[PDB]
Design a binder for this molecule. Structure first.
Ligand SMILES: CC(=O)Nc1nc(C)c(-c2cc(C)c3c(c2)CN([C@@H](C)C2CC2)C3=O)s1
Length: 827
C-alpha cells in the first residue's frame, strides 16, 4: 500500500519517484522529507475538521464579485421534491427551514444541521449570504432557469470526510578558474561571465580569452570580478554564456554562489548548459538534465577557507546603525536615487508602500547597504496585495524580500489566489532553491482548499514536459499527493480520461486525411464504445472545474471540429443534474495554447473588476486549462454559433434575410421572439462593449467572423486570438454588422449607439484604475517564456493602451479619438 501509493504518484505526475533518488541530491532529499511532513500535517488537520469546515475545504463558496424566484428542493435519498417561492434576499437557512417544515407535513413528523447541494454538482449553498450572492442562483436568474437544490445532512458530509482519509572577513575580489568545455560548433570560442542580483549586475562582466573551436576546448585561466567576496549578496547569481565569433550564441548556464544551506560554494563544478536562442540571469540555476547531448563547462570556485552567509541576528546587529521626495515618488536619476536612500527611514515611516522603489535604489553589491535595507525591511509594515505582487518579480530577488512579499500575500482570499494562481505558479520558475516560501505557501493554500489544489496540480502537471521545471514541479506534486491520497486518485481518473482522448484524437487526425467526416465520426464512436474507453471517459470531475461532474459520456453527440488539429467535441449527461448535467468539453492537442489561456484569464479578470464596480457586461469566461504538452481542455459554450455560420445566410431558415446585414438580427429574433428580443440586443450590446475594450487593451487584432461566436441569449464571445500586445499598435475595432444589431437594425440610432459608447468608456475607465494590477501580473508572466511576452516593449503596450501616464480626463479624451477613428473605419 505504501508501495502502491508511490507507483500511483509516479503514474500521475508522469515521472517515476525512483528518478528522484537516483539524482543523489541532498537538496532534493531534504525538500521531499520536509514537505512530505508539512503536507501530512495538513492532512491530519483536515481529517478532523468540523463538518462546516470540511464543506469550506471541499466545496468552497462560489459567490458573485427584493424579488421572487422559484426553487426546487429535495432530500438526499428521495425522488419526491418541493418547489418553493422565496425571495432573492432570503438566506439559505430560511430556505432550509421551509424544506424541513414541508417534510414534516409529508412524513407527518433543525435547519443548522444541513447544507444545500446544487443537484448533480460538487457545489453547495451555505453561510450568511442572500441567494442572489451565489453564482449558481445568479446564473439561474439570468438564464431564467429554476434552481434545483438538495438538502444534505451534516452526517452525510462527515461520511465524505471519513472516506477521503489518508563571511564579512573576506575582502579579496571574487574569482573563479574556467577550466574547459565539451561542445559542438563551426571561428573561436569565448565565455562571458557576469555576477547578477536579479536583473542588475553586481559588477561589470568579464570575458575569457579566445580559443579555437577545436575540442573539447581548454582555458585554465582565472576570471577575476570587480567585487569583494564579503559584498556578495545571499542570492548572488553567477551566469555564463558560451558563443562563437570571427555573433553566434551557443549555450548558457547559471548557478547560485551559495547553496541551499547558506554555505559558500567550493570547489569544482560541472555546468551542463542549455542551448541559446548573451547572458541570461533569469534562466534556471539547475543544470541541463540531458547530460548525453548537453555542452558542459567545468569551473573551479576557490577554497577561500567553510563560510556561511551571516544569520539574521548578525545582519540586524550590523544594521541597527522633502517635497521633492514626494514629487519623484509616484526610473530615476543618480541624485534622486541618493535622495531616496538618504531618507530611507522616512520612506518606512511615512511612505511604506514605496518599498519597491527603495529596494531598487539600494546598492546590493555593498553588504553594509544591503544590511541597512534589511533592518528597515524586518520592521516594515505589511503592504496591500497589489504591492506584494510587484515584489514577487525577479527585480526583487533577495530572499528576505521574497519572504516579506509572501507574508503580505497571506491575506489573499481563496478567490484572489485562484485569480492570480497562473502567475504565482510561473513565478516558481524564478526561484533559486527548491525549499522556498512561495512553494510552502501554495502547498498550504492548496491543501486547505480542494479547488486550489485541483488547479495547482494541473498548472504544474501541464509543464512536466519542460526539462527546466520537471524536477521542481514533480516534487511539488508528489508533496501535494502525500497531503491528499483521495484527491490523488480523483486526479488519476482525470489523467486516464485525457490519455484516452489523446489516443482517440490521434486516430481522428489520421482518419480525417483518409476518409469522409461521417465515416471518421462513426469510427470515433466505435472506438469510444470500447469498454476501456467508456470506463475511462465516464464518471470523473471535470479538469476545467472540479465542481462540474462529467458522468455518462454521450457517444452519439461526440464529434470533432474541422480545424487543423481536429479538436474533439465530447458531450456528457447526468440524470441527477438534469439540464445542468448536459455539458461539453473540447480536447485540443498539437497547438501551443498558453498565450490564448493567458488572454482568456485576463478577460476573466476584467469581468470580475467590472462586476466589482456594478458593471455587468455579460461576458462569457468559459473554462480553459492546459493539461500537457501542447494539450488542453476547453469548456463548450452550448446553444451558440459562429458569426461566420450565421452570416452565410442559408435559405429555408428562420434567420433568412433580404440583406446580409440583417442575418445576425434575424437570427437573434428567431431565438428570442416577442418581448425577449429587447434583452438579447442588450446582452449583445453589453458583451460587444466588453470584448471591444478587452481586445483593444490587450492589443488583439486579426478579428474576423470565424473566431467570434454568439449565444442564443445574444451574448458575444471570442474563440481565437492571439496574437496580443501588438504582436500581429492595433487600433480600436468596431464592426459594421455588430453596430447594426446595436442600433436595432436602424440606419440612424444615436440613442442606442451612444449608450454603447458609454458602456465602452465605463469599462475602459475601470480597467485604468486597476492598471497596476495588470502590469504586475504581466510582469510575473515574463517567467513563462511566451514568445510574445518576452521584453519591456510588450509591457509598454499595456501602459499605452490604458494610458497610465495620463490623467483620467486626458486618457478618456485619447480613448474617444480611438473610438471615433474606429467608427469612421466601419464602412
Ligand atoms: C457551439 C460551440 O462550438 N461552442 C463553443 N464554445 C467554445 C468555448 C468553443 C471553442 C472551441 C475551440 C476549438 C476553441 C475555443 C473555444 C477557444 N480556443 C482557444 C483560443 C483556447 C484553447 C486556448 C479554441 O481552440 S466552441
Amino acid at each position: 500500500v505504501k508501495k502502491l501509493i508511490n507507483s500511483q504518484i509516479s503514474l500521475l505526475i508522469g515521472k517515476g519517484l525512483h528518478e528522484f533518488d537516483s539524482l543523489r541530491d541532498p537538496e532534493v532529499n531534504d525538500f521531499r522529507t520536509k514537505m512530505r511532513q508539512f503536507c501530512e500535517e495538513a492532512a491530519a488537520h483536515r481529517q478532523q475538521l468540523g463538518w462546516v469546515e470540511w464543506l469550506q475545504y471541499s466545496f468552497p463558496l462560489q459567490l458573485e464579485p427584493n424579488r421572487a424566484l422559484l426553487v426546487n428542493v429535495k432530500f438526499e435519498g428521495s425522488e419526491e421534491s418541493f418547489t418553493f417561492q422565496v425571495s432573492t434576499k432570503d438566506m439559505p437557512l430560511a430556505l432550509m427551514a421551509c424544506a424541513l417544515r414541508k417534510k414534516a407535513t409529508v412524513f407527518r413528523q433543525q435547519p443548522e444541521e444541513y447544507a444545500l447541494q446544487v443537484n448533480g454538482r460538487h457545489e453547495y449553498l451555505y453561510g450568511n449570504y442572500p441567494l442572489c450572492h451565489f453564482q449558481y442562483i445568479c446564473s439561474c436568474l439570468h438564464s431564467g432557469l429554476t434552481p434545483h437544490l438538495t438538502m444534505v445532512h451534516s452526517s452525510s458530509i462527515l461520511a465524505m470526510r471519513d472516506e477521503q482519509s489518508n563571511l564579512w572577513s573576506l575582502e579579496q575580489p571574487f574569482s573563479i578558474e574556467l577550466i574547459e568545455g565539451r561542445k559542438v560548433n563551426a571561428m573561436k570560442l569565448v565565455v562571458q561571465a557576469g555576477l547578477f542580483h536579479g536583473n542588475e549586475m553586481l559588477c561589470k562582466t568579464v570575458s575569457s580569452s579566445e580559443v579555437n573551436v577545436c575540442s573539447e576546448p581548454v582555458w585554465k585561466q582565472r576570471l577575476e570580478f570587480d567585487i569583494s567576496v564579503c559584498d556578495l549578496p545571499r542570492m548572488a547569481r553567477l551566469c555564463f554564456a558560451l558563443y562563437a565569433v570571427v555573433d553566434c550564441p551557443i549555450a548558457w548556464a547559471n548557478l547560485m554562489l551559495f547553496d541551499y544551506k547558506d554555505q559558500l560554494k567550493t570547489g569544482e563544478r560541472c555546468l551542463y548548459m542549455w542551448p541559446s536562442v548573451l547572458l541570461n540571469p533569469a534562466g534556471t540555476v539547475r543544470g541541463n538534465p540531458n547530460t548525453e547531448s548537453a555542452a558542459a563547462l567545468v569551473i573551479y570556485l576557490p577554497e577561500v577557507a567553510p563560510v556561511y552567509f551571516p544569520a539574521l541576528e548578525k545582519i540586524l546587529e550590523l544594521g541597527r546603525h522633502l517635497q521633492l521626495r514626494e514629487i519623484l515618488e509616484r526610473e530615476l536619476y543618480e541624485h534622486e536615487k541618493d535622495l531616496v536612500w538618504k531618507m530611507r527611514h522616512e520612506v518606512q515611516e511615512h511612505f511604506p508602500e514605496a518599498l519597491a522603489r527603495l529596494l531598487l535604489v539600494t546598492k546590493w553589491n555593498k553588504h553594509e547597504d544591503v544590511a541597512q535595507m534589511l533592518y528597515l525591511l524586518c520592521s516594515w509594515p505589511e503592504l496591500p496585495v497589489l504591492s506584494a505582487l510587484e515584489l514577487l518579480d525577479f527585480s526583487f530577488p533577495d530572499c528576505y524580500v521574497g519572504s516579506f512579499a509572501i507574508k503580505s500575500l497571506r491575506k489573499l482570499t481563496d478567490d484572489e489566489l485562484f485569480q492570480y494562481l497562473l502567475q504565482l505558479v510561473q513565478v516558481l520558475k524564478y526561484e533559486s532553491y527548491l525549499d522556498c516560501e512561495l512553494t510552502k505557501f501554495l502547498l498550504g493554500r492548496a491543501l486547505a482548499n480542494r479547488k486550489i489544489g485541483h488547479f495547482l496540480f494541473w498548472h504544474l502537471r501541464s509543464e512536466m514536459h519542460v526539462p527546466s521545471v520537471a524536477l521542481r514541479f514533480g516534487l511539488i506534486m508528489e508533496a501535494y499527493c502525500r497531503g491528499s491520497t483521495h484527491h490523488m486518485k480523483v486526479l488519476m481518473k482525470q489523467g486516464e480520461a485525457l490519455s484516452k482522448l489523446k489516443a482517440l484524437n490521434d486516430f481522428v487526425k489520421v482518419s480525417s486525411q483518409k476518409t469522409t467526416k461521417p465515416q471518421t465520426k462513426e469510427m470515433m464512436h466505435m472506438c469510444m464504445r470500447q469498454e476501456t474507453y467508456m470506463e475511462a471517459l465516464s464518471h470523473l470531475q471535470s479538469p476545467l472545474d472540479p465542481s462540474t461532474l462529467l458522468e455518462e459520456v454521450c457517444v452519439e453527440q461526440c464529434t470533432f471540429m474541422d480545424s487543423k488539429m481536429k479538436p474533439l467535441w465530447i458531450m456528457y449527461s447526468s440524470e441527477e443534474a438534469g439540464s445542468a448535467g448536459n455539458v461539453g468539453i473540447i480536447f485540443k492537442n498539437g497547438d501551443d495554447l498558453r498565450q490564448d489561456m493567458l488572454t482568456l484569464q485576463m478577460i476573466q479578470l476584467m469581468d470580475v473588476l467590472w462586476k466589482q464596480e456594478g458593471l455587468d457586461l455579460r461576458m462569457t469566461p468559459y473554462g480553459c486549462l492546459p493539461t500537457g504538452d501542447r494539450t488542453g481542455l476547453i469548456e463548450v459554450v452550448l446553444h451558440s454559433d459562429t458569426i461566420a455560420n450565421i452570416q452565410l445566410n442559408k435559405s429555408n431558415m428562420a434567420a433568412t434575410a433580404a440583406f446580409n446585414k440583417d442575418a445576425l438580427l434575424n437570427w437573434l429574433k428567431s431565438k428570442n421572439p416577442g418581448e425577449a428580443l429587447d434583452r438579447a440586443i442588450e446582452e449583445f450590446t453589453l458583451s460587444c462593449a466588453g470584448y471591444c475594450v478587452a481586445t483593444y487593451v490587450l492589443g488583439i487584432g486579426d478579428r474576423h467572423s470565424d473566431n467570434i461566436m454568439i449565444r442564443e441569449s445574444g451574448q458575444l464571445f471570442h474563440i481565437d486570438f492571439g496574437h496580443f500586445l501588438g504582436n500581429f499598435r492595433v487600433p480600436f475595432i468596431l464592426t459594421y454588422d455588430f453596430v447594426h444589431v446595436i442600433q436595432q437594425g436602424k440606419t440612424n440610432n444615436s440613442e442606442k449607439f451612444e449608450r454603447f459608447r458609454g458602456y465602452c468608456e465605463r469599462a475602459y475607465t475601470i480597467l485604468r484604475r486597476h492598471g497596476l494590477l495588470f502590469l504586475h501580473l504581466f510582469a510575473l508572466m515574463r517567467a513563462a517564456g511566451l514568445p510574445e511576452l518576452s521584453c519591456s516593449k510588450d509591457i509598454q503596450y499595456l501602459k499605452d493602451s490604458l494610458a497610465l501616464g495620463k490623467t483620467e480626463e486626458e486618457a478618456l479624451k485619447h480613448f474617444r479619438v480611438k473610438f471615433n477613428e474606429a467608427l469612421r473605419e466601419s464602412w
